[PDB]
Design a protein around this nucleic acid. Sequence first.
DNA 1: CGGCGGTACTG
DNA 2: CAGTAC
DNA 3: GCCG
Length: 312
Amino acid sequence: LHITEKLEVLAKAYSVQGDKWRALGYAKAINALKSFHKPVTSYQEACSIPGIGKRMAEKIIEILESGHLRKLDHISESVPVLELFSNIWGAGTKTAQMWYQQGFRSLEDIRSQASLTTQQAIGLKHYSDFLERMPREEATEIEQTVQKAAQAFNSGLLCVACGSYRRGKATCGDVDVLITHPDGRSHRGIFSRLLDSLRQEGFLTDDLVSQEENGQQQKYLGVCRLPGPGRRHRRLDIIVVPYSEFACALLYFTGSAHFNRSMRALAKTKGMSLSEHALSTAGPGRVLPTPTEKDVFRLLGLPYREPAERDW
DNA sequence: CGGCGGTACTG
DNA sequence: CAGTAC
DNA sequence: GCCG
Ligand SMILES: Nc1ccn([C@@H]2O[C@H](COP(=O)(O)OP(=O)(O)OP(=O)(O)O)[C@@H](O)C2(F)F)c(=O)n1
Ligand SMILES: [Mg+2]
Ligand SMILES: [Mg+2]
Ligand code: NA
Ligand code: NA
Ligand code: NA
Ligand code: NA
């Protein structure tokens, strides 16, 4: 806390206005300022911290000394509105800035005047719902609904809830279901059947991303709702992967996002490349053998981590 | 200087 | 493609 | 913004 509470509003201001690299820098400086054993008190001290350069140091000496940070006085008043628009699924910083330039200030303005993509229209229709977390118990019910429908046309299908669910969180922003088949081939063409089964029973309410004319579809992003009173619309993400990519896909879909980024960053320093598909060597490199998550960790020179230890 | 993760849709 | 998303 |  302290200096960090002021750096954070700045970091978010930069993020929502699209300065993602500078926001990134603020993020990492804030982390470093979160785990330093002591209240920094000197320019020299701050600078000695990995993640904190001269500039960020300049701004720390200004905080606990004058109590203020003049930079916060220069945050565009547009920022709260950019964040409002930005929270619409399918609208990012470019779209929000454009709406704002065109004079849009409220979701009512958006509803009545903006031209919305199909995704943004669904995003708007479920604005509040997409901003809530569900109890992990609800994520379980949702994943089982998907699994039960999948196992209907092929009981061999492996279905696994990933993301914050697999990391053990008490609540989940949505449900991430990884689907594969141990025989290494029966995963092909399952999306059509699965999705239609799920539509058939009124489980799926909206589709956000779903290239079903592509026999090579990898992902489904959309919306579902369990039956009964007091149910909310929930975001559901499904990926279907070849068994050969199981460990990398599992690792990717388990996150956290910051964890994946860090791990891929490490692979690169070691002459590798890590994706949801595989871990390979840096033109056509070599695909490395990764039958299990542990294999990816080992090859990177790391101690294995339980999903819950990946909650970065 | 130049990377900051690597990849899949949509229009 | 630029934009957005996982 | 920060890093090598
Ligand atoms: N920029 C991103 C976003 C996601 N993911 C990977 O895609 C997975 C799912 O994305 P999610 O469902 O949106 O984020 P969650 O962790 O489950 O937190 P919540 O419950 O609020 O959703 C991530 O775990 C991932 F593992 F993090 C990623 O690799 N890079
Ligand atoms: Mg999730
Ligand atoms: Mg998700
Ligand atoms: Na430093
Ligand atoms: Na959005
Ligand atoms: Na479609
Ligand atoms: Na609802």
